[PDB]
Amino acid sequence: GTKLDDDFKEMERKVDVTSRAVMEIMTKTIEYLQPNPASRAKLSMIPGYPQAEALLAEAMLKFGRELGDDCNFGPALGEVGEAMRELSEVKDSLDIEVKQNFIDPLQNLHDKDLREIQHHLKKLEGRRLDFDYKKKRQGKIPDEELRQALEKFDESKEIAESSMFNLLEMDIEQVSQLSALVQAQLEYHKQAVQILQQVTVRLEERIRQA
Amino acid sequence: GTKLDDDFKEMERKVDVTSRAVMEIMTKTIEYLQPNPASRAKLSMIPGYPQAEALLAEAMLKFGRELGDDCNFGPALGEVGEAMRELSEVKDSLDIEVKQNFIDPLQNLHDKDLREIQHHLKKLEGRRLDFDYKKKRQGKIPDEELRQALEKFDESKEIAESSMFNLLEMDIEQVSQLSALVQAQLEYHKQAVQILQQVTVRLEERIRQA
């Protein structure tokens, strides 16, 4: 059949790579946010799920209490318990921020921008084929019909080129989205370090004393 | 049967609470380190398992490459890709540190110190029962036999009290162990924040430029 310049074929390639990339990254990012396969289903809808930190906290508090204040390990449990609880929250933030500012954007890029292009390409193919066909039987079919056959094709290719070119041009917006992710992570870990140190002092205050 | 002073009963209580606590906390801590139920089996043996971060990195690199350098999102993927890879490692550290300095200690406390006490108590019970029995038939059995019956009991109680008291006295060592955990976490998150910021500059360097 008729052929497309290497330039065209390249964009089409990068488009595919982008699409495929967006998909896996999206998945992996989630499996990252929620390793446990039971809690992702929530991030695949939205948190209506518990955090590991939460559950740990829940427990440390539970026993720290039961032990009592008379002891020394009992209170320390409540102390670290809170620390964990706090971390739990800092986490929910992270999950939500990443979902909203990284996953959703990508998801939209796949269902919006990319799907569009996919369509275009398919249309182009058909137009390509139809032409090749009507071409084979040139003498048989009226010139006008064959001319239109080509025009339709050219017309289609352009649309494809535009949609593809435009998506590939603004690719920096994906970089922006990457930054969107790394930002959300930072705020979290930074915020984490705060919580951790905050409790470290409280425990040192114990161990140091007796 | 014969009875034990409230003081004794209390220690026995705290001992049980401690034991039960150590167990759940141990579990939760692990489920925390490895939410996904397939990778804990490794931390329940030792890392011979992949980290979520790792797998994410693996992917971001994979595509960042395939995209190429011609683009702008391709390189950015490799950039963040590394960042993730780095985090992956900082994580393996965390898993290992927590395992070695928090889980193992506790585990040992359960199999060593606590198991011992468990034994003691059981022995005490038997000695308690036997006495109650031989007591019921006092006139029937020789005084000497009954005397020994009691001595054995008293003797047993002491052992129990010592083992229990000593474990409960050094309870600060558990606090130390808690600190051991929080420390390992801190080094990690702190170390994390470093990696994150390190990459944030590289991306800003892109987005800012064009």
Q: What's the Cα-to-Cα distance from B31 to each of A52, A142, B7, rounded to whole Å?
A: 7, 73, 36
Angstrom distance (rounded) from CA A8 to CA B117: 77
SS3 B171: coil
Residue span of the structural domain in which A64 resides: 1-210
Interchain proximity A14–B56, CB inside 8 Å: no
| Experimental approach taken | X-ray
| Contacts by A129-134, CB closer than 8 A, 24 or more apart | A129/A1, A131/A1, A131/A2, A132/A1, A132/A2
Answer positive or negative: Cα dihedral of B44, B50, B51, B52. Answer: negative
Angstrom distance (rounded) from CA B106 to CA B22: 6
Angstrom distance (rounded) from CA A32 to CA B115: 38
Across the interface, of B55, B172, B190, the residue whose CB is closest to A72 is B172
How many residues comprise chain B? 210
Interchain proximity B196–A207, CB inside 8 Å: no
State the CATH number of the domain containing residue B61. 1.20.1270.60
Angstrom distance (rounded) from CA A198 to CA A192: 10
Closest CA to A171 of B62, B61, B77: B77
Across the interface, of B72, B182, B190, the residue whose CB is closest to A83 is B182
- Total domains, chain A: 1
Tokens of B43: 């931390």
Which residues fall within 8 angstroms of residue A176, CB to CB, at 6 or more apart? B207
Q: How many CB atoms lie within 10 A of CB A144?
A: 8
Contact list, B210 vs chain A (CB under 8 Å):
172
DSSP states along B8-69: HHHHHHHHHHHHHHHHHHHHHHHHHH--STTTHHHHTT---S--HHHHHHHHHHHHHHHH-S
How many residues comprise chain A? 210
| Contacts by A201-206, CB closer than 8 A, 24 or more apart | A202/A79, A203/A76, A203/A79, A203/A80, A203/B175, A203/B178, A203/B179, A203/B182, A204/B179, A206/A72, A206/A75, A206/A76, A206/A79, A206/B172, A206/B175
Interchain CB contacts (distance < 8 Å): A and B:
178
Best mutation target, B28, B73, B193, to test chain A (most A CBs within 10 A): B73
Mind telling me how many Å the CA of A166 is from chain B's nearest CA?
13
Angstrom distance (rounded) from CA B12 to CA A49: 37
Which residues fall within 8 angstroms of residue A193, CB to CB, at 6 or more apart? B186, B189, B190, B192, B193
Mind telling me how many Å the CA of B123 is from chain A's nearest CA?
25
Cα–Cα–Cα angle for B200, B206, B209, rounded to 5 degrees:
130
Resolution value in angstroms? 3.1
Q: How many CB atoms lie within 10 A of CB B82?
A: 18
Mind telling me how many Å the CA of A107 is from chain B's nearest CA?
16
Angstrom distance (rounded) from CA B63 to CA B71: 12
Angstrom distance (rounded) from CA A188 to CA A179: 14
Contact list, B172 vs chain A (CB under 8 Å):
72-73, 206-207, 210
DSSP states along B102-145: IIHHHHHHIIIIIHHHHHHHHHHHHHHHHHHHHHHTTTTS-HHH
Closest CA to A32 of A193, A174, A173, A182: A182
Mind telling me how many Å the CA of B173 is from chain A's nearest CA?
8
